[PDB]
Design a protein around this nucleic acid. Sequence first.
DNA 1: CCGACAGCGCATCAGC
DNA 2: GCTGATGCGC
DNA 3: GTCGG
Length: 326
Amino acid sequence: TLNGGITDMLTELANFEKNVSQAIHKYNAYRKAASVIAKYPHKIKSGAEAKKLPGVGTKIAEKIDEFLATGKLRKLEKIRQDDTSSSINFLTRVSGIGPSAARKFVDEGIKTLEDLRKNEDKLNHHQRIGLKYFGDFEKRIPREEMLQMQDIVLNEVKKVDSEYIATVCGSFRRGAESSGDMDVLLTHPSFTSESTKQPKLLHQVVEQLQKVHFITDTLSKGETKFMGVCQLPSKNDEKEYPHRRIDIRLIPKDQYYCGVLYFTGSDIFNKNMRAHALEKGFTINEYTIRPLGVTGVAGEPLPVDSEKDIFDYIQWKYREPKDRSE
DNA sequence: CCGACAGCGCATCAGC
DNA sequence: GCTGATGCGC
DNA sequence: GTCGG
Ligand SMILES: Cc1cn([C@H]2C[C@H](O)[C@@H](COP(=O)(O)NP(=O)(O)CP(=O)(O)O)O2)c(=O)[nH]c1=O
Ligand SMILES: [Cl-]
Ligand SMILES: [Cl-]
Ligand SMILES: [Cl-]
Ligand SMILES: [Mg+2]
Ligand code: NA
Ligand code: NA
Ligand code: NA
């Protein structure tokens, strides 16, 4: 974090563009710049120096010069002082409240935690749970707790059907010392790209995690993706652990490598890798890598028997999960 | 200059 | 009910 | 906002 001040500034600009301006490409431009600077191994001395990095252009270069000179950005100073922008930015920190809902709430004069609490009837189910655990969801998860949660999830999944394979992905699989949530990839031999030979495969696992009181709440749930809330059990007389977000994704078993590549991330790594794929004439999703024909239509799935196979196709040297934290 | 920017699951709604 | 668009999420 | 062509 040689360049913490700068990458914080760009992230704040990103968040403004996403939540207030609703300019998603500006958001991603700022995040890409923050990312490339984050792993740049020198303490940056100028905007011109930063502008050599890909993703950093003239505008960001000038902002870095202002920041280096003064320790601040006037544009951000103003944004921080704007009530509508500060309110909208805040409301989006509730899970299930995005830029559109946030602006709409602020329109009706709902713009604080208190306002949300008194207007619970105006929230959909996801938003109500996001509000319920607002404090908890901004806390990080020590890797030691991630390991206990892993133990529980893998053991409970085993009790349902010993042929399930649960893999913890996200920042955990990239070796992070703390995670923002838990991400779990699930496979079962009955569910492949060819067939689903058994219904309720995700439901059964969710139901078991609920019954042992690990999963406490549900934000959303379909046939292949669960989004909800979990909690470690605490000992006698101990303060309870915070509630945690948990994502579970059931992936066709024969497509495990594309699925684990996707769910390991980072999100910016995935965007960079999939963009590069396109430049190489392929498209990557969580299921397949496919060639692009001249028209731009995707062809048939290419054989994949490892994460590295996917890197090979697009002519990237293999990068271990721990080196994917972009 | 300017088109493209990763790719997809689930919830909610409008239009039929 | 379905289909397609949009919001929010991974 | 940035970049490739
Ligand atoms: C948010 C997001 C996630 N993903 C993938 C990659 C990510 O690593 C995986 C888990 O999502 P996450 O939101 O839990 N991200 P994380 O890398 O686990 C970081 P954190 O959860 O520890 O804060 O889902 C994407 O491909 N695109 C995305 O926009
Ligand atoms: Cl934009
Ligand atoms: Cl600032
Ligand atoms: Cl596919
Ligand atoms: Mg995560
Ligand atoms: Na650059
Ligand atoms: Na939110
Ligand atoms: Na997650």
